[PDB]
């Protein structure tokens, strides 16, 4: 199999990604970066977010994995005196693949992202919340936030967002600061969608600041934002069980 | 075919009673393997409906009518018999199986609860066999993703669509402070993954399943899991979840 | 005067006779009766009881409180030694509980105050100084002194209050808060002389709580609380950095 | 309300722009403005409402105020609220009540509200409502990360007359500070500094908090 390793950048990660790479040349796995079949991040959750954003159009055949240097986070599983064992594993093709579920951010021609843990939206700030062409509050704030399953222990869960299982296919909406009045009454809970479930939020300004996963883009005259489980998934090359609600319990408690 | 029709008992849904029955009259009654249970009255209603034919649920079709589970208004009660009257297809909601070990199982609808008696209330909580928290406070409350609209919203869950296969546990007035930290926020659950509520100082707990809430000495497991059964509901119309969380919290401009 | 109470333990009753031995010497007597230093020994609900003891004779009495391993005591086992020799005053406020049938009963309470069903729904509305404010349908509600914010009060969601600080807070628990029943969510701070009143609708529920004691009550017709215009006095010695055992008790 | 002004100050003493009557217009938003004397309002919770008025036209009742301090240093009042937020990134701040540390708080940021303020932002960040009249004042956290290493209280705050929450710098040094509706960046901030001023505010009277919050949010 091709692969390519990515790294935060420190001179500790950079100098696995040389050790790893010599350490592949053994084997009968090749060097790419531009259609990897496998693809590697050192350092964490931040930069795992760059690898997966790196080759978004080719994220249908691409198993990733992770190396994070201290503790664990939630997307890297595996540690840098693990590499050697990983490098060998990885070579006999052993390894079993996962799939977590994705959402789409289309504006409005239109724009169209993806999003591995979350996308919001700000900006006086006063939008109208429609479900599936259905009006369902109008709301004035801060932002909203849409946040993917593996995304729910993130800005999600700072608020108030549940804590979701990544296998579960869904998104979560949270409010940011409603003000929830009379005039502007919005339910307050987190709302869990489902797959071809559309939330599209419209304008009552439409120049908001659009933020997809860390990257916020501020857009110009938008006529409507639309939130969707999006069709591709993302898939972890995995050796050995992942425990979720473990990995809760140890960044939380 | 066959029939039945639970009735809330109050003056509103008892004129409906048989004024449905009758109605049925040209086109039969049964209480104990009907394929079909209505309720008349409301959720708590459609509930005690669920948990008195719970047994037989593979081979019924829910329908209900209110004077979250109920989708039809009395005024339409007889394009109802008009319409279950030729023959829909059904829709089904996950429910959430309880078992209890001193072994005890229920399934509920809506949630379950664990709080204490008096004394204080402290349970280990243990997901997929893993110690996760120890959590003092009122109680837990699992619900299933009908559910969420009860009980577990006024806790501050998340509402989920019930085509969802999940659970839910939310805290009730958790003590958080360097002896008991707990997660704090909601924690959605899949199938096949098991949260074990198990004692520590007090062994007495109370323990409600939907509306029979129960008080149960000699406890050392509590162990929610989502089920392999479902509950169907029969469909003519058909619904829009968040339709009726904005008609319950937000507006009914009509 | 003095006077000492203890948790019943080995340890409490341990130190109440080694103070009442410092005691007999110095121009200072006991007597449970008519004191006017009242000393707890053993943590705070040990010191929620001693207070309950003497309600008539507050706006009169000093309170310590002494302590294992708090909120209201302030000195630990090992210091007893020395506060014998230097207590050889600060207020904090509390909130009157009035229930109505068919005579009216009525309670201080030095944390908070709890309402409940006795079995059924919850449902009861609440009137602010005579004007209808929201209608409840949940579990209960709280309303806590400020001494009483980091108890239930700040499970509940409430917000922490320095105790000097003259209100009341009422939080929720639960309620439904749908078209029908809509209420404000928020905690909700009333100051002195602000009528805040419990009639129900329905059904004559009501298990009420007063700090620990769980008292049912059937048919009451009306409930109300407001600022107290008693008050209880702790002897103090050093300032307090109430803030500081907030960052204990909680923070690491 | 252009066509409401100077309409009845044609109906009556006198009019100059050290006033001893400012009258707001058309509700609480830029009632703040005019904020920066009895004060009245009429709107289109601080403006209590216009022939009857000038008709009528008193008792003077008291509302508290926020100082604000950064460090020349410059000091900000505040009727509703001030935040502290950072520029960038990660906004990280230790907070120092009665020159004594309490938490290092990590998130969005941090909001210090008034009493009359409470109804306002803070309540949408969780606050406790309070009646104005209370001596006090407020803060509520933004959308913290509480885990392992930023351990932070969770409810909200309320500080009487005379203490002080301070807040100080971690990592960066710039923070997008922010007073009622204003918004003036600082960079080199190395304190700031939330403490109940002196200051009182009179309204001319001639309320029902709890109704008029009734009316708001029931």
């Not at 997966?52 to 201290?70: P, S, V």
Request: charged share 25%.
């Amino acid at each position: 199999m091709k692969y390519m390793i990515t790294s935060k950048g420190d001179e500790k990660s950079d100098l696995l990604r040389l050790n790893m790479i010599a350490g592949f040349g053994e084997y009968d796995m090749e060097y790419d970066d531009v259609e990897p079949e496998i693809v590697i991040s050192i350092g964490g959750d931040g930069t795992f977010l760059s690898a997966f954003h790196q080759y978004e159009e080719r994220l249908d055949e691409i198993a990733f994995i992770g190396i994070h240097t201290g503790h664990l986070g939630f997307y890297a599983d595996w540690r840098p005196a693990e590499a050697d064992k990983l490098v060998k594993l990885l070579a006999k093709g052993e390894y079993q693949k996962v799939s977590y579920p994705l959402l789409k951010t289309t504006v409005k021609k239109e724009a169209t992202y993806l999003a591995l843990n979350e996308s919001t939206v700000k900006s006086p700030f006063v939008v109208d919340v429609v479900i599936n062409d259905i009006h369902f509050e109008r709301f004035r704030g801060d932002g909203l936030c849409m946040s993917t399953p593996s995304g729910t222990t993130a800005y999600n869960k700072s608020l108030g967002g549940a804590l979701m299982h990544p296998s579960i296919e869904a998104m979560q909406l949270t409010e940011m600061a409603s003000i929830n009045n009379r005039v502007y009454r919005t339910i307050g809970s987190p709302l869990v969608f489902p797959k071809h479930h559309v939330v599209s939020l419209q304008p009552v300004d439409k120049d908001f600041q659009i933020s997809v996963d860390h990257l916020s883009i501020l857009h110009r005259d938008v006529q409507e934002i639309r939130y969707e489980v999006s069709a591709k998934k993302i898939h972890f090359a995995r050796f050995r069980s992942f425990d979720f609600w473990r990995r809760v319990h140890d960044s939380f408690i």
